[PDB]
Every structure is written in structure tokens, then in C-alpha cells.
From a paper:
A highly specialized RNA polymerase with an outstanding accuracy is the [name]–adding enzyme (tRNA nucleotidyltransferase) that adds and maintains the triplet sequence C-C-A at the 3′–end of tRNAs. Recently, we could show that the [name]-adding enzyme from [name] (PhaCCA), a bacterium from the arctic permafrost growing at –15 °C, is such a cold-adapted enzyme and catalyzes [name]-addition in vitro down to 0 °C. Interestingly, both the N–terminal catalytic core as well as the C-terminal tRNA–binding region are adapted to the cold, indicating that the psychrophilic features are not restricted to a single protein domain, but are distributed over the whole enzyme. Our results reveal that a combination of individual strategies – a global flexibility in the tRNA-binding C-terminus as well as a thermal adaptation in the highly conserved catalytic core motif C controlling interdomain movements during [name]-addition – contribute to the remarkable cold adaptation of this unusual RNA polymerase. The crystal structures reveal a globally conserved scaffold with local adaptations to provide the structural plasticity compatible with catalysis at low temperature.
In order to investigate the structural properties of PhaCCA leading to cold adaptation, crystals of the corresponding recombinant enzyme were grown. The crystallized construct consisted of the [name] wild type sequence (377 amino acids) with an N–terminal extension of 43 residues including a 6xHis affinity tag. First crystals of PhaCCA were obtained in the presence of ammonium sulfate as crystallant and diffracted to a maximum resolution of 2.8 Å. They were used as seeds to screen for new conditions and led to crystals with similar cell parameters and symmetry but showing significantly improved diffraction properties (extending to a resolution of 1.8 Å) in the presence of PEG 3350 or diammonium hydrogen phosphate. All crystals showed a high solvent content (67%) with one enzyme monomer in the asymmetric unit. The refined structures are very similar, showing a root mean-square deviation (rmsd) ranging from 0.16 to 0.22 Å (for 370 superimposed Cα positions) when compared to the reference apo structure solved at the highest resolution. Their N–terminal extension is disordered and the first visible residue varied from position −4 to −2 at the end of the extension. The four C-terminal residues (HSHT) are also disordered, as well as the central part of the flexible loop (residues 82–93) in the head domain, except for the complex with CTP where it is clearly visible. PhaCCA is unambiguously monomeric in its crystalline state as well as in solution, as shown by SEC and SAXS analyses.
Numbering used by the authors: -3 to 87, 93 to 373, 378
Amino acid sequence: DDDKMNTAIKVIHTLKAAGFEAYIVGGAVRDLLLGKTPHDVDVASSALPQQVKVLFDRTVDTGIDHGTVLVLLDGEGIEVTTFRTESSYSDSVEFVLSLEEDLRRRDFTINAMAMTEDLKIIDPFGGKEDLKNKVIRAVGDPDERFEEDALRMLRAIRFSGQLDFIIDMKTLLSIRRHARLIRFIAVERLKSEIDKIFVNPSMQKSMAYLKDSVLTRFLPVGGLFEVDWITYHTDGNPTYGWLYLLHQQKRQFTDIKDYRFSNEEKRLIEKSLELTALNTWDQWTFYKYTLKQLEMASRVTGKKKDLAAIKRQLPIQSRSELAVDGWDLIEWSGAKSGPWLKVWIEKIERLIVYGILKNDKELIKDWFEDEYH
């Protein structure tokens, strides 16, 4: 935020005092020229990774093989990457000696700018003009950029909504010709880009481009993204886009399971879908489902109830508060432990959640001894 750019300027100054070239590069330059505050600030340098580690007290060496060292300084983290090009196999990183060799194989012209310590902008590919005209355009030959990393095709879509830009005609036609190549991309990278689209502004533009680019033809279950997105308003959670997608089509979670959801995200989607299929919600509904599930289900169905208050006013919040357990029932019934205990604990739990039976051991005992015997 208010400290990342300053810290990167310090990093650059330190790299240059050791005789290396260093520049701000990529998204930070784009954001600076748009008048936004960069979320990430990357530095490109002639220094190799181990030479960066010599110059800074605290570094994180995860991306070393790819040329990247994270520098920890003044409470920020600045990625320092040696000049490099990378290529993706259908199943490779090459360090280079000049900045321009690095820049000419980046994805889009607005991401292929560098800025010096003295605020001079190095813009070999017209990023400044494309930024002013709000155009996402591939650097150089779009066919080549997309053959290098087919995920860039979907990233163009994501950028169009993130920035409210159009996609350059030649670039878009190239995506259409190469959309088949999306099949080689790990579904985790695909899901990460789609999650961004779902929470970004102008997502209806992004979704139209997704279909227009032919990507929906070849994405995993890609045709499912061609719903009417007019009613969609993000709540800041990408999961709500996937739920909105399924709800519009009356489809179930299994239809999108190729994207490898976490067990938590899968549960939120399924339990929310179950809620949208329930005709009436009562105290049991608010007791058994989480508030996040009730809220997401209400959002896709357009309701605007005060869900938190209904849940808050139930007699109890969870099984933890129940005043009896299966061992009480074993005592009172004189029967051996078995699956029957779950049936009868739930009977008692329902009577308590509906406020019929008091949550009190002796009163539950009185009720149980009457109903069981």
C-alpha cells in the first residue's frame, strides 16, 4: 500500500549500489500510470537470485529456480526476479541478460513496462498508449504469447473486467484460434482466474468475452458458464459465482467438480443449493445450516430476510448445548448402546430447538420415560 512502492525504490537503490540493473516492472507500473495503488510491486534485476540474497538481511527463497527472491524489508515483501523468459510444456525458465529480452515475452503490453528509480518509463511495446486507450493487447505476436502459456488467454478475459478494458481485436481473434490449448492448463490455475473474474467489476463483460473468445467451448464444463449473469452481484466471495452458476441452470455441484474445490467450498455450495430447493425454512433449518449457507441461499433466490437474528434467537445454537447425551438415554432406557441413540437424541434435539421441550436433563428425562416406555 503506502509503503510497497517506497520499499521497492529502496530495493532498487540497494541493487544498483551493488552495480546491478533494477526496475519496477509489470502490474505496479500499470497501476501507477492508472492512478491506483499497487497490490504487488515486482522488481526486475540483472542480479541473479543468490546475489540478491547477499544484499538483503531477510529473503524468502521459494521461487529461486524460477529466478525470484522475495525481499523482506520495512515490513513489506518485494519480489525480485532476474531477467528471464519462461515457457510452459503441454505437460522451463531461461535467464536472459537484458531487460528487453525479458519484457518482450510478457503477456500484455500494459504489463510489459518498466520504470526506473527516477520515474522514467521503459515502454518498448506501446503499453502507455494501450493503457490510455484501455486495450489489452498481447506483446508481439499473440499466437506466440498464447502458445507459450495458454493460461494467458483466460488472463486476458480476467484483465478486461478487472480494468474495464477491451481486448485488442487481433489478440481476441488469436485467442479464438488457440482456445483449444486451454486443455493443457492445470485446473487449479483455471479456477484461480475464474475466482478473480467472479469477484471483479464488470464481470458480465468478462463472461461475454469468455464465450466470445471460444474459451467456454473448451474449458472444463465450459458451456455451464453461459448463463445470464445480469442478476449476479458479487458478495466478495468467489464461491457465490459458482453457486449462482449452478442455481441458474438447476444443476448440482457434481457438474463442476472438475475444478477441484476444497472440502469447505464444496460444502458451502451443496448446502446452499439444498437450501434453495427447500420450500419452507423453519427453526430446524436455521439451526442445522450455517449462517453463511443461509445467507448465500437467500442471495441467489433474491430474499432479504434478517437471517442472523432468526438464528440468534433459537433456544440453542448447537448440539454442544444439549442437556442430554446418549449415555443418559442408556441409563434411562436400560437398553444397550446402539444406533437407536442417534434417532432419539435427534427427536429430543428437535423438541428443544422448536422450544417445546425445555433444555433441562430432568425435564428431558420425564419426556423420554413417557415416550420410550
